[PDB]
TrEMBL record, chain B:
Superkingdom of the source species: Eukaryota
From-to range in the entire protein, with total length: 227 to 264 of 316
Name this polypeptide is given: Brix domain-containing protein
Endpoints of the signal sequence: none
UniProt-annotated location(s): Nucleus, Nucleolus
Organism: Chaetomium thermophilum (strain DSM 1495 / CBS 144.50 / IMI 039719) (Thermochaetoides thermophila)
Annotated family: Belongs to the BRX1 family.
Length: 39, 38
């Protein structure tokens, strides 16, 4: 199913999109729980 | 009975330089425009 006969056919996230204090882009990651590891 | 204080250990002074919003980056929230570096 190609529409235009001689062109090329058109063609796990760890952060959150949040507005920062200044007004740009701020990334919010998964918080760290302080549970002690088995090792 | 009352209590008195006897000093133990670390006697040290903290000149504020900067306070950021991010974990170790992000926008600057507080900047101390007095600091004279060594």
């Amino acid at each position: 199913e190609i529409l235009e006969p001689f062109v090329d056919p058109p063609r796990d996230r760890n952060y959150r999109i949040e507005k920062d204090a200044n007004g740009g882009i701020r990334y919010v990651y998964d918080e760290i729980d302080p549970v002690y590891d088995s090792d | 009975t009352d209590i008195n204080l006897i000093e133990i250990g670390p006697r040290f002074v903290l000149t504020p330089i900067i306070i950021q919003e991010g974990s170790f980056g992000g926008p600057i929230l507080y900047e101390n425009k007095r600091f004279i570096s060594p």
